[PDB]
Paper text:
The precursor PdDfsB is cleaved by subtilisin to yield biologically active Slf, and the chemical gradients of both proteins between two growing colonies could be accurately modelled. However, remarkably, the dfsB gene is widely distributed across Gram-positive and to some extent Gram-negative bacterial kingdoms (PFAM entry DUF1706).
There is even a homologue (irc4) within the yeast genome. The first of these two contain many homologues from Gram-positive bacteria, including pathogenic species, and also the yeast DfsB homologue, IRC4. An intriguing question is whether yeast secretes a processed form of IRC4, analogous to Slf, which goes on to control the population of co-cultured Lactobacillus species. We were able to express, purify and obtain crystal structures for DfsB homologues from Clostridium difficile 630 and Escherichia coli UTI89, as well as of IRC4 from S. cerevisiae. The overall structures of CdDfsB, EcDfsB and IRC4 are identical with that of PdDfsB, with strong conservation of overall topology and surface charge, particularly in the C-terminal helix.
Residue numbers in the entry: 3 to 170
The structure:
């Protein structure tokens, strides 16, 4: 539930900064370590955010340029997000933690900029984006929440757990 652009932007920033801050103490040498019962490495964790946040921005970019938007992505389907994630890991996994963090910070700033340029109705009322219709009656802000606030929260838990369990 969000009432304003300011409220949404502030919640994204709050959850994003707590998430990113967890990577400060992680060694580059350990970025690919798979730890027991933790589904992703630090590098995979970041690549997942880079994937969805950039995909969100790309949906909007395609639609306002007048293009059809295949969601989640061309060649990928909602019933096979695992394959989509694999494309994320492959795409962003060739970069360091430092590099992935910088990219993600830039992508989140683009989200701030996007929210600012939306009209109130475009952000908060359904029926304004074709790409948002992918889930019936969801306004854009919901799509933004579930790809920023929500995963920055959940995957902060995952990366903290990774740090609790990673071997010396
Ligand atoms: Cl994980
Ligand atoms: K990895």
């Amino acid at each position: 539930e969000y009432t304003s652009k300011k409220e949404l932007k502030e919640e994204i920033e709050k959850k994003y900064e707590k998430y990113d801050a967890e990577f400060e103490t992680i060694s580059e040498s350990q970025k690919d370590e798979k730890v027991e019962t933790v589904d992703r490495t630090p590098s995979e964790n970041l690549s997942y955010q880079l994937g969805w946040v950039n995909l969100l921005l790309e949906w909007e970019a395609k639609e306002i340029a007048g293009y059809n938007v295949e969601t989640p992505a061309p060649g990928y389907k909602w019933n096979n997000l695992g394959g989509l994630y694999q494309s994320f890991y492959k795409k962003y996994g060739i970069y360091s933690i430092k590099e992935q963090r910088a990219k993600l910070r830039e992508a989140v700033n683009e989200v701030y900029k996007w929210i600012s340029t939306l009209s109130d109705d475009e952000l908060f009322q359904a029926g304004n984006r074709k790409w948002a219709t992918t889930k019936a009656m969801w306004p854009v802000y919901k799509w933004i929440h579930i790809n920023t606030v929500a995963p920055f929260t959940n995957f902060r838990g995952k990366i903290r757990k990774w740090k609790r369990l990673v071997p010396e």
